[PDB]
Amino acid sequence: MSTIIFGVVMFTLIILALVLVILFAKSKLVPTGDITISINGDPEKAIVTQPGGKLLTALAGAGVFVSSACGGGGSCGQCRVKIKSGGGDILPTELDHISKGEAREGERLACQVAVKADMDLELPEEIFGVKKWECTVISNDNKATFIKELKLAIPDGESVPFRAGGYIQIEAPAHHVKYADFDVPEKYRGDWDKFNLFRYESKVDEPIIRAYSMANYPEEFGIIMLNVRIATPPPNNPNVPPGQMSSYIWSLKAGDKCTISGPFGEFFAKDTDAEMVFIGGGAGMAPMRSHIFDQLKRLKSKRKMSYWYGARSKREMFYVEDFDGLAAENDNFVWHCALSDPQPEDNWTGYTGFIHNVLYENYLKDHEAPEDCEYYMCGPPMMNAAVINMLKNLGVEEENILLDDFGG
Amino acid sequence: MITIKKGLDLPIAGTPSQVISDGKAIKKVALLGEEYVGMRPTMHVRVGDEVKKAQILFEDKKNPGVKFTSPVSGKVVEINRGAKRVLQSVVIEVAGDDQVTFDKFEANQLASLNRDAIKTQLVESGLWTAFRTRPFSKVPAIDSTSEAIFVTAMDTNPLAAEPTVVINEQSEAFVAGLDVLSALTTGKVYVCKKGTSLPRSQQPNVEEHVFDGPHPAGLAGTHMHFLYPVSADHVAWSINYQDVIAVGQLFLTGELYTQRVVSLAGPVVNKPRLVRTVMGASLEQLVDSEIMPGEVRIISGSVLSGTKATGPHAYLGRYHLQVSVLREGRDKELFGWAMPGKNKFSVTRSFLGHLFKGQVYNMTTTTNGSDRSMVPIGNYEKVMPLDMEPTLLLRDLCAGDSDSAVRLGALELDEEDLALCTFVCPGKYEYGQLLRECLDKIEKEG
Amino acid sequence: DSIKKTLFVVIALSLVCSIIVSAAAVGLRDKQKENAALDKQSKILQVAGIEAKGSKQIVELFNKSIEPRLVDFNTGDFVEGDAANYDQRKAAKEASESIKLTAEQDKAKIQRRANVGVVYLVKDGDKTSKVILPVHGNGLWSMMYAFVAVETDGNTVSGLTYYEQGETPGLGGEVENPAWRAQWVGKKLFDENHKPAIKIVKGGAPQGSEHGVDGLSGATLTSNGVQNTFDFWLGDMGFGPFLTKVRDGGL
Amino acid sequence: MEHYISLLVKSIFIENMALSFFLGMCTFLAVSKKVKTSFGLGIAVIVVLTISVPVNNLVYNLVLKPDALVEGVDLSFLNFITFIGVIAALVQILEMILDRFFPPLYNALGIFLPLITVNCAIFGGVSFMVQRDYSFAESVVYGFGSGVGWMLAIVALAGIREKMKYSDVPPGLRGLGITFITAGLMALGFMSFSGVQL
Amino acid sequence: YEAAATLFYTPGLVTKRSSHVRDSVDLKRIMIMVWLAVFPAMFWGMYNAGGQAIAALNHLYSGDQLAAIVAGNWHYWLTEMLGGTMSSDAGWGSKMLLGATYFLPIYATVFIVGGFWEVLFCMVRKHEVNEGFFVTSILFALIVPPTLPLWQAALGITFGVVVAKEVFGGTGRNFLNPALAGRAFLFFAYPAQISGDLVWTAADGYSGATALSQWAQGGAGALINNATGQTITWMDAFIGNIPGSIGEVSTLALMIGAAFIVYMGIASWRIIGGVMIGMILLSTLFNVIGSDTNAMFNMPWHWHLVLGGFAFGMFFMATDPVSASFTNSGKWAYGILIGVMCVLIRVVNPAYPEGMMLAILFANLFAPLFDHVVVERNIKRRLARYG
Amino acid sequence: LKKSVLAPVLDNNPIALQVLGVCSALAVTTKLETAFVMTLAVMFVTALSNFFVSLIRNHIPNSVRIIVQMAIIASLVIVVDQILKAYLYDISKQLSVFVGLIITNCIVMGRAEAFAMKSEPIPSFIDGIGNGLGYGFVLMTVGFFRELLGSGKLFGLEVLPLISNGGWYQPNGLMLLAPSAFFLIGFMIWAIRTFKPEQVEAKE
Ligand SMILES: Cc1cc2nc3c(=O)[nH]c(=O)nc-3n(C[C@H](O)[C@H](O)[C@H](O)COP(=O)(O)OP(=O)(O)OC[C@H]3O[C@@H](n4cnc5c(N)ncnc54)[C@H](O)[C@@H]3O)c2cc1C
Ligand SMILES: CCCCCCCCCCCCO[C@@H]1O[C@H](CO)[C@@H](O[C@H]2O[C@H](CO)[C@@H](O)[C@H](O)[C@H]2O)[C@H](O)[C@H]1O
Ligand SMILES: Cc1cc2nc3c(=O)[nH]c(=O)nc-3n(C[C@H](O)[C@H](O)[C@H](O)COP(=O)(O)O)c2cc1C
Ligand SMILES: Cc1cc2nc3c(=O)[nH]c(=O)nc-3n(C[C@H](O)[C@H](O)[C@H](O)COP(=O)(O)O)c2cc1C
Ligand code: FES
């Protein structure tokens, strides 16, 4: 019995002694002092936080969204920051995302940097322009059998500093929406009723964010135009849940308001004297319209231009009036379109099949310098892969191949 | 001064007689677009266009400002493009004697010209493409400078010509080119040569260095490894002696000088010798009625690092100074691998051939075996005079470990620095392609 | 004040864990000791030739038939003490209770011998039929421990079992083979002059030999180990004087 | 002096922790990819083992050993908790020291730095020391030798794995399985010292 | 058959890239040359095995007992049926025949089983079957006792070919010696059949130790051939008139064979010299230290050379290019380590009388580390801007 | 429920995919009885440590998290050791140091840190049981081959009559040494990743 008490006392004493030693060592070694961070060279808006923690969290608290979309993971980005002091160490986890040629310039991922000492950043000026507007929807009318156009008005008359081809960030809270409430004109409801898609419904639990390219160009002041597709489960896998934000965006009625952020963008045109070739299909119409309108009307460049668009059926074509007007007004721009698998009722006359095949057969097969001109594309992965392969086969270098990408 | 112990002088048959004679008439010349590393051409001509000597044919997208010009006056007759529309050659049919002209200077003024004036003249005339850069063996950017320009006044390739015979005819032009290079260098100019006498330049920048030994002793890679080790921070420029003569002639007479003196030799050449030709000449017409009957392979350059001259590529290379011709060994022999070959060459002592000193072989284009994994019996160490671990470096290249290859010294090498290693590989590997792939990767993502 | 909470949590958790650990460790101590005691007793019964199954039967038979005793190696006389709980290995390791052997004496390569050893007397009644001697020595890979039971004349073996050898199975571990062990019964440890005479014959022992035992096939180093074990433990530095007393009839 | 030299060589070669007792295999197999990373991890293991074995020797001989504190009480059932607590505290203190003074090594093996508490080699070394009843100097020498042997084994495995950049392992074996087979062959080679008793 | 043409003829291929001429040597010739270099050792091993067996048989039995013994063993009565004899006056032909009836079945089994495994792996992986398995199989067949069971030989070759070579990608892709890996598998799996006094002479009921075992027991005075009652001399051990593994006995024949491959540049004289240096150094150190209880302490280097499998390993198994170091400086260290380990295992390890295969397998683990040290020094020299 | 219990058997096996608990696998797999007892002990300890760590997860301070977790684990292992010595004396003797080394078994600490510290008690208990089953799968599979081919026995019952007992089978002596365990685990991983190719590691 006397040994049980000894065992208890010795266990407690040994554990307590080890804990006290660890605490004393921690007190003597770790700094324990606050840190100061300068977001750039050298605004007065220095940030003072406690030691440790993630640099991404510190910037999010300061209000400079990187990114900062999810606060971790490093899955995608557009999650990079520039450092000129403090964080001079190199972490092995950043090399597989940052190339050797650009790592030496002092660029690091925000979600990887650790706040152990005072550091100074070199963020590009564009980041500081990020802020939100509570835009009011002008209209959300339907344009195709699976696509709608959303137009927004900036409150208080504020104008967005942006470059043609940019994209915005859309943020909405949790919601529950049924597909039966969609305001889809009967003109496009034939396939909807054939597939009985109105029976679907969606549920969201927490606020969500997404990115959307804008169909307007700078001369259109105070208006943000977006082209949105319906995230509908495939007929092969109806049991798959539908989209989380596309359903709410489609159900959204005119006159409502939401919060958008940005703009952001890197899919800008190059300032050369060479020809421009634009390729698109379905929802990709927004960046193409932005680029074409900007280049033709605002810049008034004489560079040769052309646009090639792919559609499922003759019912899927929109902006046709604007593009025909542009072609008539300017001899420097001419556009063509082809139907992948139109219905017999379309009574279509013209190019058919894949847009990439049509383009190669009609324009590039006879072009004298396919590599000289620049290629801009945005569309479904099926089209994108074929177009990339065809251009590589023709010998076009990556420096002249540019595209917008989406996924999930 | 410097003696190379490791190497190999290939005892191939048909060695040229070092005497210069007039060559056969040439009707077509071409510029080959695949022999310039990293070149992406922008064509400035089209089939049927008349051209003058030194007129621009195309530029480089990846190297702004560099011009590739016509060696002769005539008409563009072909523009050959291969897989993925890769440019193969631009063929010009000789006609007329039109040309573009430039400024003239006296021998006194050459050593004291502006680097900018020299650069503009060279670039405009198209002679700027004679230079190459270690690492990556690319044409220098027109806005860059190098502290070391290496002149190659020796040739140790098998069946190669004798630089002394050629230089003695153009001593004044050689000296003028040396003066221009001394003005252009910003460091020193290294004239790497053999133990015999050559015309000298009085400028203190120009230094003559003597190399002795078997083949690799005559390579710019070896010369740099021994006199100015190169790396990412230190880059040297390389130019051969005939290009130096061309530079001297350009700056002395104000017009491009496209003459060449190559060696036509090989086991199947009836009368090996040196012949006067023109830059980018047609090898098909050059070797007409000069070879024995049968199926033969014509090579632009040495049998160690040349280019097969077939069809669209049947034209003299830019950096090649010899034409090699040898038979095609498609024969199959019973137990040929087990014979006690008195007529079989090898750097190992497993054949009877090595016992007959001075023997000369009628070598063919055979791979004496099939592809296999590397079993390092120590052949590479016998032919590599540089301070490297050849077997480890080659295994690194084969595995594709570019970072470790750079650490082991890949940045100092050209495809022609591993020709002997490819030669003596029991597994029949070809390390030039692997080295080029690794260098391309380093350049692209570095 | 984080420190207050961390100290409180650590102390409470330590108390809760320690009570359980200590109670478990102290509750099972007697059974843990009894398990080892039973394991020891089983081997002695087996070598003595008494069949026993189960802990109850093992304990009953061991208490009925066996009688541990302590022996002074130098003189072979019995000594008083707790023979049941004596630990000869610890005694040998201890400097106050052991002697450091010399190269000329350390035949078996044990390097140390306890001053007092323990033997077990097999009794079928008032008289004693056998005495069991624990012996050990170095093999090729490890130290090997065995029990040898000798008749009451002090010359004739009745059985031998190796209970801890750790040699190579099939080659050196054959010391545990029942067929090999059965060869020892009837052999005589001493000759007419009362000197050790056990022989581990290489290549097989003669027919009907009274001193030779077949050596292990292909395991001459372990055979040498066994031979050295017996050469030492039958000598003057081992059970020599005690076996002399037994032969004279002091058992 | 011969005693300690023999003990050191025995620990390094005859009783190699990695390839004779086979302890610490999880990290010995995971972190063998690069020679210099293995070198750093082995240095850390050396430091931890050398510091920890003698400290546990002192604690065991002063408190836990039977009859050490009071006549008739044996607290040997606290061996596991005492050993693991000492090892964990030392690992944390070394982690803070490396963080403050050695950012290079800290970032080199930051992920596995806290995982050397669970390395079976250190706990096994402490247990073997307790069994063998070493003195203080013997404990120091034994810990140092065991750490050095573990470092040698892991560095050799890393060298082999680097040499294997030229291999053509089947997809199913690529990685874990081939590393297991390699370690088995290494143990086969290390069996040369089996019969040596030192 | 298809395999016939692809092994007897040459591919008839040409080149495709910048090196338009190639060396005559190839892997096929290299491997066949190494395979031919062990023929004298193989033939002497057969003859010696036959001679030892006949001498032991006539030492043990005679007359009707010998007749019954020969009638009861297929080796013996096949030798007699094919024109040979089993009497004391048997000639070199009879001894060679008796040795052949032991060696040939082992070699055939090893070849067939290992070839099956190699072909299976190469066909499934869609490679081209290549040489070097010839060397592996012949060496494995030569480094085993004459009495090894055939199923054990099959298991050993299976382990060596599959676990050590094919699983890493085949020839040129491994890091360990395949033949020695198979031998070690046998060593540690069935030690009773590859050690002791009952396996090194193929005579029924005969027990006898060999020179390494006898020296460890009683020094140089214990070297006695009990079959003939004579004393083993240095010349006997050098010529190969001693029991042991089949092809290891004749140091003279092994030297004759190795001289050719060393001259041809296939084997590394650097490795051989390193092995010799290490052996001499450690043996002389042991001789100087001395011992009063271990007779192996006073065995000189020239006796170390001619006993056991030292010469065989040094000449033919330590020179495997794939398992060795890839640097000239590292080869010396590799060889020195092999020699030192061999002598150490011979002397201070009482469990094993010989240590060649263990030493080579140990050095196979550390060769890449020597390469690492050398290459790191080279890289530092380069960074100093001296190439 | 069965998802959390059965995933660590083949989909997320500790030894074959996570590389945890290799030492005991190499050590205690020469006899099926010792392998089985080790499997049960690891299951018990991991389940209970997960349960308790999850119970008190909110109140553990970051400064001494390792100390708290290892105190719980070591207490459980000490109790298990006492029970084994009291009731399974022979098997405890055979295991020797590896009963104590359960504390440093990587599986227990990994599951405590990765799951229990952020999950609920019952889920943590189930996760511990599942990981124990996954560990035992490899333990028993290796032990079966090792024991059968090294001693011709299963659970101590003679299956192949040995040559020394008048039988026909000669046991393999390499099956009683670690290299056999290394090779067996390697080939088992090969088979698993052949039947489930999604686990194949990329060439990079
Ligand atoms: C920079 C950028 C710009 C973009 N611009 C545009 C644009 O201009 N126009 C446009 O139409 N799109 C654009 N997109 C695509 C973007 O993803 C849109 O938000 C798109 O409409 C998807 O809508 P969502 O996010 O509501 O659907 P999500 O739910 O994010 O994705 C839909 C898919 O996820 C599946 N899914 C949803 N919930 C679950 C679940 N719980 N489990 C399993 N599967 C689930 C659905 O079945 C469907 O397959 C852009 C993307 C990026 C990155
Ligand atoms: C990858 C990890 C390691 C893998 C290890 C694999 C081990 C595989 C073991 C295979 C089993 C072989 O088992 C062996 O088979 C042969 C087949 O004749 C049996 O037979 C053999 O012995 C008998 C004994 O009476 C002889 O009469 C007979 O001529 C002989 O063939 C052996 O007695 C048996 O021991
Ligand atoms: C792997 C292996 C293990 C061995 N184990 C033992 C052993 O445990 N005991 C033994 O006596 N011999 C063992 N030997 C045999 C010895 O090495 C030695 O050959 C033998 O003792 C000589 O016996 P002999 O005097 O009859 O020739 C083993 C051999 C090998 C290869
Ligand atoms: C290449 C080679 C390596 C060998 N390696 C070993 C070894 O490591 N251990 C061993 O006990 N025997 C080994 N042997 C076997 C011995 O050399 C020899 O055949 C045997 O010892 C003969 O009996 P003896 O030991 O009495 O001389 C090897 C043989 C050869 C040919
Ligand atoms: S924080 Fe989400 S990718 Fe970086």
mmCIF file with all atom_site columns, C-alpha atoms in Angstrom, chain B residues 389-422:
data_model
loop_
_atom_site.group_PDB
_atom_site.id
_atom_site.type_symbol
_atom_site.label_atom_id
_atom_site.label_alt_id
_atom_site.label_comp_id
_atom_site.label_asym_id
_atom_site.label_entity_id
_atom_site.label_seq_id
_atom_site.pdbx_PDB_ins_code
_atom_site.Cartn_x
_atom_site.Cartn_y
_atom_site.Cartn_z
_atom_site.occupancy
_atom_site.B_iso_or_equiv
_atom_site.pdbx_formal_charge
_atom_site.auth_seq_id
_atom_site.auth_comp_id
_atom_site.auth_asym_id
_atom_site.auth_atom_id
_atom_site.pdbx_PDB_model_num
ATOM 1  C CA . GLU B 1 389 ? 33.421 12.299 -63.500 1.00 0.00 ? 389 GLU B CA 1
ATOM 2  C CA . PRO B 1 390 ? 32.347 11.167 -66.983 1.00 0.00 ? 390 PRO B CA 1
ATOM 3  C CA . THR B 1 391 ? 30.419 8.023  -66.041 1.00 0.00 ? 391 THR B CA 1
ATOM 4  C CA . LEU B 1 392 ? 28.474 9.758  -63.264 1.00 0.00 ? 392 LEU B CA 1
ATOM 5  C CA . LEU B 1 393 ? 27.714 12.735 -65.509 1.00 0.00 ? 393 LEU B CA 1
ATOM 6  C CA . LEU B 1 394 ? 26.522 10.484 -68.336 1.00 0.00 ? 394 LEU B CA 1
ATOM 7  C CA . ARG B 1 395 ? 24.279 8.472  -66.019 1.00 0.00 ? 395 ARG B CA 1
ATOM 8  C CA . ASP B 1 396 ? 22.879 11.764 -64.726 1.00 0.00 ? 396 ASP B CA 1
ATOM 9  C CA . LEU B 1 397 ? 22.141 12.877 -68.289 1.00 0.00 ? 397 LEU B CA 1
ATOM 10 C CA . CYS B 1 398 ? 20.475 9.566  -69.138 1.00 0.00 ? 398 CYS B CA 1
ATOM 11 C CA . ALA B 1 399 ? 18.325 9.699  -66.002 1.00 0.00 ? 399 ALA B CA 1
ATOM 12 C CA . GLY B 1 400 ? 17.364 13.295 -66.795 1.00 0.00 ? 400 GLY B CA 1
ATOM 13 C CA . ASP B 1 401 ? 18.595 14.918 -63.564 1.00 0.00 ? 401 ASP B CA 1
ATOM 14 C CA . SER B 1 402 ? 19.359 18.401 -64.856 1.00 0.00 ? 402 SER B CA 1
ATOM 15 C CA . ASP B 1 403 ? 20.260 19.962 -61.500 1.00 0.00 ? 403 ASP B CA 1
ATOM 16 C CA . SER B 1 404 ? 22.827 17.289 -60.683 1.00 0.00 ? 404 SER B CA 1
ATOM 17 C CA . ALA B 1 405 ? 24.101 17.467 -64.268 1.00 0.00 ? 405 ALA B CA 1
ATOM 18 C CA . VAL B 1 406 ? 24.692 21.201 -63.807 1.00 0.00 ? 406 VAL B CA 1
ATOM 19 C CA . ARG B 1 407 ? 26.485 20.483 -60.537 1.00 0.00 ? 407 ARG B CA 1
ATOM 20 C CA . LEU B 1 408 ? 28.631 17.866 -62.292 1.00 0.00 ? 408 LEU B CA 1
ATOM 21 C CA . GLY B 1 409 ? 29.574 20.267 -65.088 1.00 0.00 ? 409 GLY B CA 1
ATOM 22 C CA . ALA B 1 410 ? 27.103 20.018 -67.954 1.00 0.00 ? 410 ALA B CA 1
ATOM 23 C CA . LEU B 1 411 ? 27.097 23.791 -68.479 1.00 0.00 ? 411 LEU B CA 1
ATOM 24 C CA . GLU B 1 412 ? 30.662 23.595 -69.830 1.00 0.00 ? 412 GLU B CA 1
ATOM 25 C CA . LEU B 1 413 ? 29.862 21.060 -72.555 1.00 0.00 ? 413 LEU B CA 1
ATOM 26 C CA . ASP B 1 414 ? 28.676 21.001 -76.151 1.00 0.00 ? 414 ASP B CA 1
ATOM 27 C CA . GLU B 1 415 ? 27.313 18.067 -78.123 1.00 0.00 ? 415 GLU B CA 1
ATOM 28 C CA . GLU B 1 416 ? 30.769 17.690 -79.686 1.00 0.00 ? 416 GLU B CA 1
ATOM 29 C CA . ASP B 1 417 ? 32.429 17.327 -76.269 1.00 0.00 ? 417 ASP B CA 1
ATOM 30 C CA . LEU B 1 418 ? 30.721 13.937 -75.780 1.00 0.00 ? 418 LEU B CA 1
ATOM 31 C CA . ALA B 1 419 ? 31.338 12.592 -79.289 1.00 0.00 ? 419 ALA B CA 1
ATOM 32 C CA . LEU B 1 420 ? 34.081 10.232 -78.107 1.00 0.00 ? 420 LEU B CA 1
ATOM 33 C CA . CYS B 1 421 ? 31.937 9.121  -75.166 1.00 0.00 ? 421 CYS B CA 1
ATOM 34 C CA . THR B 1 422 ? 29.200 8.231  -77.650 1.00 0.00 ? 422 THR B CA 1
#
